[PDB]
Amino acid sequence: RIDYIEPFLDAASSVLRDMLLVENIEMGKPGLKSIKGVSVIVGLAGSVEGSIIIDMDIETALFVASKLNFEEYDDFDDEETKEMVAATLTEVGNIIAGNFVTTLHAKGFVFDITPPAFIYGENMKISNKGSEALIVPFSLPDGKIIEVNIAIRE
Amino acid sequence: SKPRGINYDTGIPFNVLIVDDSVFTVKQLTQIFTSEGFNIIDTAADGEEAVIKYKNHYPNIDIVTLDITMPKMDGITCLSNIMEFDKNARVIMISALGKEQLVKDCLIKGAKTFIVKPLDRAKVLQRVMSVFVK
Ligand SMILES: [Mg+2]
Numbered sequence: 001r002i003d004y005i006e007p008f009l010d011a012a013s014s015v016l017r018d019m020l021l022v023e024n025i026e027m028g029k030p031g032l033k034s035i036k037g038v039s040v041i042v043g044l045a046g047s048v049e050g051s052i053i054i055d056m057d058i059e060t061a062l063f064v065a066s067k068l069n070f071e072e073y074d075d076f077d078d079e080e081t082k083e084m085v086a087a088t089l090t091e092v093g094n095i096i097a098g099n100f101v102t103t104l105h106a107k108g109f110v111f112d113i114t115p116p117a118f119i120y121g122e123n124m125k126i127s128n129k130g131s132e133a134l135i136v137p138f139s140l141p142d143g144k145i146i147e148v149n150i151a152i153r154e
Numbered sequence: 155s156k157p158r159g160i161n162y163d164t165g166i167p168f169n170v171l172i173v174d175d176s177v178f179t180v181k182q183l184t185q186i187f188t189s190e191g192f193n194i195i196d197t198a199a200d201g202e203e204a205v206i207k208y209k210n211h212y213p214n215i216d217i218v219t220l221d222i223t224m225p226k227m228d229g230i231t232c233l234s235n236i237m238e239f240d241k242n243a244r245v246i247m248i249s250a251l252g253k254e255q256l257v258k259d260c261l262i263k264g265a266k267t268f269i270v271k272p273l274d275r276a277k278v279l280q281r282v283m284s285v286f287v288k
Contacts, residue, residue, distance in 0.1 A: 015272065018272050019272050068178070084178060087177040091176040091178045094176070094223060094250050095271050095272055097250065098249065098250025098251045099250060101251070102250075102252045102270075105253045105254065105255065113223060114223070115224060115225045
């Protein structure tokens with residue numbers, strides 16, 4: 001079986017720590033169960049079917065976008081801050097997912113990813129569930145939580 | 155210190171075409187290149203737009219940075235298309251995907267070098283100038 005749990009945890013933690021440079025992105029307790037706000041979705045294709053989903057509240061989304069662009073964004077409803085917020089978070093998703101599938105030439109398959117999707121002002125993105133789910137919360141210095149989820153399709 | 159983005163045979167900045175579906179990444183690369191003296195001749199958010207713009211500026215593009223995962227047209231398909239149009243094109247792949255064989259396949263298809271994300275100014279710059287030897 002494709003052993004993705006460790007590769008996933010390593011990719012998620014590794015990328016966040018390398019991109020957001022704020023001392024202490026703490027890995028929470030991985031759990032089978034869950035998380036409005038925003039959500040980034042990167043589909044996993046090829047031999048495995050699934051997806052990588054990153055969710056956080058609006059405040060956290062602005063905080064993260066602010067740190068990554070080295071400039072303050074405090075109005076997610078501003079028409080161009082919203083543009084950069086979306087583009088920044090989806091790119092974080094793209095990098096986590098890419099590094100993840102890359103550490104997979106540890107298997108005799110092929111693991112592809114799709115362009116990312118940004119779902120904000122969302123319904124607690126019901127991306128429902130009938131396949132291996134794993135939610136991993138990462139805490140930023142303040143109360144801000146970024147949850148990285150991977151659902152492979154057994 | 156001789157900004158690297160300047161062609162010292164004319165004093166004119168080298169032209170860079172940035173291709174990535176993320177405006178965040180386009181902005182990061184833009185800062186990196188301009189701070190070093192390069193001129194961003196144009197940018198594209200997908201492989202189709204990249205091909206059009208590359209042909210539009212063609213003789214004048216000195217280097218192309220190319221992402222892989224993108225809507226409408228991915229960077230691997232884009233790479234082959236640009237190399238088909240212009241055998242002398244200089245493309246550097248810059249992507250979140252880094253499987254080692256993918257790297258070799260892009261080089262085989264014509265890319266000069268490859269850069270794995272997340273980005274840092276220093277690395278990008280060192281890679282960009284290696285495709286500048288004679
Ligand atoms: Mg991309």
